[PDB]
């Protein structure tokens with residue numbers, strides 16, 4: 001989680017204004033319940049050395 | 050200064066206003082995004098009467114959207130100008146309507162009147178000093194009549210010193226679609242007659258007849274009807290927002306149309322209606338405008354006042370006119386049908402001259418009428434109630450909600466009083 | 477025309493130092509403006525005693 | 526011209542439909558006046 | 562939001578429910594797997610399916626209907642079918658024993674230990690739902706298991722949930738065709754139980770469906786495939802308001818308010834006008850006028866009633882497709898001018914219009930036409946009492962000599978309930994007569 005929010009600067013392929021009047025809750029919603037999962041998670045330099 | 054705050058109620062008033070604000074915005078020339086394109090000094094001048102200021106030159110519409118059903122508002126927010134409309138102003142209920150008057154007037158309203166009152170006073174405190182309020186809804190509307198009747202009652206004690214403009218469409222006389230619709234009429238118009246000071250009466254059948262006559266386009270949209278009525282409401286509001294030697298304040302007008310308190314129902318009148326060839330076949334001249342202004346066919350409100358007489362006449366003119374063609378034209382019509390006015394009052398004309406023409410046509414006008422032609426209207430419904438109250442159709446719903454036929458007894462009694470009242474004044 | 481119209485429209489032409497960045501008028505006019513004097517720049521040289 | 530509905534979505538337009546699509550006139554051009 | 566839950570009871574009521582969902586997945590483009598193409602439609606479950614399907618994070622559209630049956634043959638067969646992967650296995654409630662067409666057997670013997678199971682399903686569906694306007698109940702009077710089992714269910718859902726709607730749909734017993742002579746007994750056993758609890762029951766008859774097939778659809782040898790497709794189109798049309806929009810949008814709450822005149826009777830008639838073969842649609846014309854004439858033509862109604870022998874109270878037309886008020890409002894005005902149509906003077910207006918710009922689509926491998934203007938006619942008339950009048954005379958004969966009674970009493974029931982129900986019909990028929998008296 002720290003890597004995502006702080007280091008990875010969160011999810012790139014996401015659309016920025018993915019939050020607006022929705023369906024059931026006819027308001028700003030479809031922003032984030034999915035959360036990033038992609039990209040090398042465990043690839044700092046100390047492992048290879 | 051003196052400003053106006055609007056309320057949109059009922060799912061019709063959802064479609065009514067949405068055409069009506071876009072009419073205002075395009076006339077003032079604001080883009081769909083909201084960044085005003087500065088072209089006219091005077092429209093930048095008196096925009097404050099209806100719009101407040103946001104950051105970056107965006108003028109917020111000072112109106113509040115109230116409903117119960119999502120889809121109707123879902124369209125308007127997804128509509129062309131929903132972005133300029135405020136989600137803060139989108140108050141709604143988490144329930145369906147059922148097109149039942151009591152549910153919206155006693156059941157659903159109770160938990161929503163608190164929110165809307167807190168809302169409307171917030172914009173009331175935001176602005177300084179109103180002329181009053183105006184409402185787009187329907188008397189034959191289920192949720193529109195149910196909510197408005199509650200709100201008009203509550204707004205009376207809150208601010209009894211302003212203008213209670215009401216814009217309601219009368220359903221089609223031949224068929225009302227809704228079968229319990231007349232019951233809604235009684236429940237609405239009974240309470241309307243006390244709380245309101247102004248009421249506009251609109252009928253769709255005439256709008257259909259107008260389409261056959263001058264539109265001649267066979268298949269219109271209801272939005273076209275929204276566009277037509279918006280032009281009518283816009284014209285009377287052009288008075289306030291635009292310069293020219295015309296006295297525009299609604300009370301400056303209301304005292305001029307209302308001789309006695311019970312006169313709340315008024316009929317509109319509009320200016321040149323044209324067909325496909327007539328645009329280049331018409332010499333835009335003061336007589337033919339006024340001739341077309343006073344045409345029983347150009348009537349659009351409820352029915353033909355030929356069966357009755359005229360109480361007051363008031364037409365406001367928009368274009369580059371002078372004080373004398375309006376002067377002579379009234380004499381011509383005054384001499385034309387002098388007898389069809391009432392001998393109670395002579396010279397009942399109330400004219401205002403707006404020198405700022407519209408965008409698309411130059412020479413225009415609007416007329417508001419109070420004639421002796423409303424009798425047949427409530428007469429028509431009167432036989433319905435005397436019929437359908439003879440054996441109490443559809444009663445178990447409302448009575449289950451807590452309705453009693455005693456309420457119906459006074460509501461009809463009040464209207465039959467108005468039946469004689471409108472009758473006695475002229476007859 | 478809003479509240480306080482006439483001078484606000486008229487002052488911008490006499491006040492010919494408008495900032496370009498948004499909201500920087502206070503930053504620009506933090507030192508102040510020219511209010512306590514005539515619009516003309518110079519009334520010296522008056523050897524009038 | 527069936528343009529009378531713009532919010533509708535069909536899927537297969539290759540397969541022909543039926544119906545006698547009425548011609549379309551004007552909606553707000555009447556409100557406008559005489560281009561050129 | 563705007564959503565409902567459907568229930569399908571008995572082997573009779575399940576194949577039609579499959580067709581409806583099969584029809585429903587066509588206009589929603591649902592592949593048999595359970596996921597859309599690479600096009601983006603999935604999320605928190607928010608699009609046209611959200612009122613019908615539940616395409617959650619698993620990406621699989623979950624239909625909002627429960628299939629309940631007591632005999633595993635058919636339900637396991639569809640569990641081997643094409644769309645079974647979408648269908649939830651224990652939402653496909655099956656049984657191991659029959660009711661032998663005995664209403665009480667399906668009402669007392671076995672339903673007790675099965676209703677608790679479905680009640681868990683109902684509540685576990687209830688928690689995830691938001692708007693939940695009501696229920697879509699498919700059943701049959703001549704239900705070997707449809708009659709008894711659903712009746713107790715309808716009671717239990719009534720007692721716990723009495724603030725929402727319950728929409729009943731069943732095949733009405735054929736006036737002159739009887740697949741069972743125990744079918745008559747359970748029929749009033751259902752009516753007398755359901756009169757004081759059912760919200761809105763909409764009926765239909767198979768013979769007239771066949772009569773349509775070789776009249777205008779021109780099929781002398783159809784099957785349930787067409788039979789279930791046609792009725793599946795009917796419910797699709799009324800549910801298009803939930804799916805799509807139009808000039809005005811209507812909900813079942815408005816249907817229940819404006820259709821039923823008075824308590825007890827909630828039994829209108831349904832009809833779809835543009836029922837016509839394919840080749841006919843090619844070189845012929847559809848417009849509001851003739852279809853209004855057709856829908857009000859007496860032989861186009863699917864229940865054996867003569868409107869000239871009755872009188873109308875309400876009429877609901879759901880114009881699904883591209884129409885305008887002008888011709889519609891003019892045509893209905895001409896309809897009001899007609900003298901043959903004997904509406905009760907009690908109603909000056911009885912017409913409920915629902916406009917929906919969506920026109921119905923064709924189904925691949927289908928037999929319908931290519932419609933642009935479609936309408937569903939919902940109406941209630943007094944010409945229906947003859948059906949109950951046709952009922953009672955077969956019953957008073959059968960009950961006068963106590964046929965099959967040893968069977969029903971052998972499993973623990975008695976005659977008082979049978980005695981009780983007969984005056985209910987007697988109460989029902991005079992009610993029909995008295996309201997017929999203006």
Ligand SMILES: Nc1nc2c(ncn2[C@@H]2O[C@H](COP(=O)(O)OP(=O)(O)OP(=O)(O)O)[C@@H](O)[C@H]2O)c(=O)[nH]1
Nearest residue numbers: 059060061064146148187189190191192193194271
């Ligand atoms: N929006 C809209 N309303 C229409 C149209 N034609 C007639 N109406 C009437 O306008 C009335 C006002 O709508 P609302 O007051 O918002 O309706 P409601 O309170 O939600 O309940 P109902 O009146 O039963 O629909 C409705 O009752 C309709 O009968 C139309 O084309 N568009």
Ligand SMILES: Nc1nc2c(ncn2[C@@H]2O[C@H](COP(=O)(O)OP(=O)(O)OP(=O)(O)O)[C@@H](O)[C@H]2O)c(=O)[nH]1
Nearest residue numbers: 571572573574576659662703704705706707740785
């Ligand atoms: N709903 C429906 N009914 C059908 C179909 N085909 C025939 N029928 C009729 O529906 C009736 C079936 O009712 P029942 O036999 O009582 O069905 P059940 O109560 O669910 O249980 P079973 O006794 O096992 O069939 C028969 O009498 C047929 O006349 C069909 O596809 N769907």
